[PDB]
Paper text:
This enzyme was able to functionalize a diverse set of substrates ranging from monoterpenes over sesquiterpenes to steroids.
In order to prepare protein for X‐ray crystallographic studies, the gene encoding CYP109Q5 was codon‐optimized for expression in E. coli and purchased from GenScript already ligated into pET‐28a(+), equipping the protein with an N‐terminal histidine tag. Crystals of CYP109Q5 diffracted to 1.55 Å and were in the P211 space group, with one monomer in the asymmetric unit. The polypeptide chain was complete except for a region G165 to A175, constituting the ‘FG loop’, which could not be modelled presumably to its mobility. The major difference between the two enzyme structures was an extended loop between N58 and P77, which, in CYP109Q5, has folded up to meet the G‐helix, possibly restricting access to the haem. The active site cavity is large and hydrophobic, with I232 and A236 at one side of the haem, and W61 and V80 brought to the other side of the substrate access channel by the movement of the N58‐P77 loop.
Residue numbers in the entry: 1 to 164, 176 to 397
The structure:
Amino acid sequence: MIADIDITAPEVLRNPYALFAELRRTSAVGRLQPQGFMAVGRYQDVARVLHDAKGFSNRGWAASLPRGVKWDTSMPPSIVQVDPPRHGKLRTLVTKAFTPRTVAQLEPRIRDIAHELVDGLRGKSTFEATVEVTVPMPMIVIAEMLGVAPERRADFKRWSDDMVAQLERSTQEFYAYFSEVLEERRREPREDLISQLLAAEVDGEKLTAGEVLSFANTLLIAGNETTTSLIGNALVALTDHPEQLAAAQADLSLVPAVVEEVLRYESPAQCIFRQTMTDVEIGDERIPARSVVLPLLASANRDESRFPDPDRFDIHRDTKGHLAFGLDIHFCIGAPLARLEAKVMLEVLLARLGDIQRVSQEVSWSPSFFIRSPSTLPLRATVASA
Ligand code: HEM
């Protein structure tokens, strides 16, 4: 039933949109079993939830955290777990460092990274797109933004891979290293994000050291797997829609639109987390106080109410108002960076690769309801040099 949703079901992992459509048709609210989490599927309702920060707290994100893992309790929580009024203070501080200006200025380096990744494909007629392209790009870009020393880049990869007993070690090593980095940049700042986070000051208030480190950590967790997902999902959508791929390969100015339609069609973050603070009502369904609630961004983005023929992938549709990056106060800080990495990587892939096909018609999706991404994506294509 819609009151007995099993996210482990192979059909749900394969095609969650069938469940989502059934939920939207049936009820404003669904229930996951055995987690007991409440799911909200209709576009208007998802938007209402995200705009209602007083009724739907971000402390719900605590429900997503891996059990059996010891957290350094001197580390403040991720910004994504914080509610007003603390949230606004923190967000205004971190976005003095992680700014649209700093993201836009990365584009030349991002293009170079894209070209180097495609250089690794030369002389091959098949490649595995995740390991060779979509997984490295976000991780390389964020390590450069954070000022990671060249000799610590492989440790950073390992930490990144582990965050997608081992997990505890990687988290401890991440913070040990960035603590050291933070003290070095207090002495001699550079142009990197740690330096800029340390400098930030608003109304004579500054981030604590814990807050700097916690935000650094958030950027890996928040940014890597989701951006990887966007690029892989784009490759899946384009290979499923040959004529659209063909169109974009002939006109690279389409790529921003491709990216927006993948964001809507195969939303990387399929849902997010909230917790009700009171008894609340959505679409005449009451949700008890203290329930974990999953606003189903992916369901909202495929809601016929908002997006006509929503199961049609159409790079020429109007994508305005999709909720892939959320909405309102917690709207993705990384949204310009994700959009830029994806545009640049797809511009380079599309320009340099000839005919692109999947090896397999079947996509092996990662076994996550929460993040929609290919576990592997073997592709057939020929490279043309940069
Ligand atoms: C396609 C890629 C991405 C998607 C789909 C995505 C999606 C989202 C969503 C849905 C939220 C809102 C969470 C909420 O309301 O609880 C969010 C928040 C956030 N994302 Fe992203 N994101 C992506 C990439 C990035 C990247 C590249 C970064 C940074 C490098 C990043 C950093 C953040 C941060 C810091 C927040 C928290 C903002 C806050 O709580 O105020 N994200 N993301």
